[PDB]
Design a binder for this molecule. Sequence first.
Ligand SMILES: CC/C=C\C/C=C\C/C=C\C/C=C\C/C=C\C/C=C\CCC(=O)O
Length: 133
Amino acid sequence: MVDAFLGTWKLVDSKNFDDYMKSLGVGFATRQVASMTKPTTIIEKNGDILTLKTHSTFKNTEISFKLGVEFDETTADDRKVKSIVTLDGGKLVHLQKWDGQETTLVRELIDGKLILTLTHGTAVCTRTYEKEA
Ligand SMILES: CC/C=C\C/C=C\C/C=C\C/C=C\C/C=C\C/C=C\CCC(=O)O
């Protein structure tokens, strides 16, 4: 089910990430640094517990979750959110809720690349990751 997503992924394309960060209220200096950072995303499973690590020179995050079970999360920009990750149409869909707001982080595989679509408000960011060996 989620096997094709597992492994180590490196950022290779980013569109509209500044728009997404600005929609979330991220300050200009953080958005500068973030716009030049190329994170590595590691997705691992152990039974039905997934762990998703995002590593960079600026900030690191890690979450663990079961699909379809809500979890508390503190995001890279310090939002305290209620999260759930599920498979939907073969896509790994992560929904975050806080203060009545929502954002979605949708991952899909296209030609072996991992496409992450981030939506908040009207802002839609598309980031592309390539698999590391
Ligand atoms: C954690 C390292 C990943 C990306 C950029 C570097 C530092 C992050 C700090 C601030 C960014 C601010 C807001 C972004 C909001 C949510 C984080 C979601 C996705 C990170 C981007 C990704 O996984 O490619």
